[PDB]
Design a protein around this ligand. Structure first.
Ligand SMILES: CCCCn1ccc(=O)c2c(N)nc(-c3ccccc3)cc21
Ligand SMILES: [Mg+2]
Ligand SMILES: [Zn+2]
Length: 323
């Protein structure tokens, strides 16, 4: 217990005080307790607590359970990444003006999904799990293996005694919400983003994009999840550079495991010996994966431009190092 008593007892500072509406937000200076308070504030200011009759103590317990079920020693995919993903979601809904485009249930699902989307991440990739004969890969037939696991864990915590923040929902609202959560968490598989984004970009290019179409709505929610998942790439250079080091640390750690467990030379991305490739890889990733997404999101809501602006600024910085 102990953290629950401290967390539950605390007066939760305002969103303005906590700076969580800012796209350029940094978690680095905050304690674990402070990030927990921020998370309560996100639920509160998105009209989720009273709307769905969440008990304060239960919400606090759930937040702590989510935090606890990240592996703190995994360099990047730990609680702070999940927290930052949820913070970007909050900022996008608020400053980015996405909130009024979505239903209450969608907002509820997205915030829960953001916080839960990498739960119990082992610090290695889907490909690694497949290649090391993971029981998870077998269970999920090699498809979005990690993300199926994150969803499993999400459900487990939601059903845990004392943590049931969705216990107040009606049977139909509960069904709807769980389905959105599943899709949102699965969407964070970059493989699924690459597979599905073409449709999204095409719809926008052809002036066919329609949020009132159920399929296009869920496509948009998947893209929004990815935008938040990759949010560190949009941050002020010092914040982005620090987080980029964590990403590389984790990838190189996998490479070490690959050499030992698979007797293979890792790809550049996973090869510490070839760490000189980082700036060029960062530029390539921003071009291939990031820019089009933040451009598209800004098309949907102009107020999301700061994410695009930040991404472009980071591209310039990396390219200066690379060339
Ligand atoms: C060392 C990274 C090289 C570039 N890179 C290659 C392939 C990837 O799959 C990824 C990735 N998933 N994320 C990032 C990243 C995200 C936020 C902030 C900083 C970086 C980078 C990346
Ligand atoms: Mg993930
Ligand atoms: Zn993630």
């Amino acid at each position: 217990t102990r953290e629950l008593q401290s967390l539950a007892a605390a007066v939760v500072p305002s969103a303005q005080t906590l700076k969580i509406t800012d796209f350029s937000f940094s978690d680095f200076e905050l304690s674990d307790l402070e990030t927990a308070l921020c998370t309560i504030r996100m639920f509160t200011d998105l009209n989720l607590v009273q709307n769905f009759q969440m008990k304060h103590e239960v919400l606090c317990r759930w937040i702590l359970s989510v935090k606890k079920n990240y592996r703190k020693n995994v360099a990047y995919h730990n609680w702070r990444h999940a927290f930052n993903t949820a913070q970007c979601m909050f900022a996008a809904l608020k400053a980015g003006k996405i909130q009024n485009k979505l239903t209450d249930l969608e907002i509820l699902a997205l915030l829960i999904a953001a916080l839960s989307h990498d739960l119990d991440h082992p610090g290695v990739s889907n490909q690694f799990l497949i290649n090391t004969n993971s029981e998870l890969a077998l269970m999920y037939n090699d498809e979005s293996v990690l993300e199926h696991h994150h969803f499993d864990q999400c459900l487990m915590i939601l059903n845990s005694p004392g943590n049931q923040i969705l216990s107040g929902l009606s049977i139909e609202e509960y069904k709807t919400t769980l389905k959105i959560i599943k899709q949102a968490i699965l969407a964070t598989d970059l493989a699924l983003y690459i597979k599905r984004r073409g449709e999204f970009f095409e719809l926008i290019r052809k002036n066919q994009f329609n949020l009132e179409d159920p399929h296009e709505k869920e496509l948009f929610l998947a893209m929004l999840m990815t935008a938040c998942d990759l949010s560190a790439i949009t941050k002020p250079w010092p914040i982005q550079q620090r987080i980029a080091e964590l990403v590389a640390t984790e990838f190189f750690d996998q490479g070490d495991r690959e050499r030992k467990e698979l007797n293979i030379e890792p790809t550049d991305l996973m090869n510490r010996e070839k760490k000189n490739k980082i700036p060029s890889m960062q530029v390539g990733f921003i071009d291939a994966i990031c820019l089009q997404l933040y451009e598209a999101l800004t098309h949907v809501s102009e107020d999301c431009f700061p994410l695009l602006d930040g991404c472009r600024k980071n591209r310039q910085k990396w390219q200066a190092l690379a060339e």
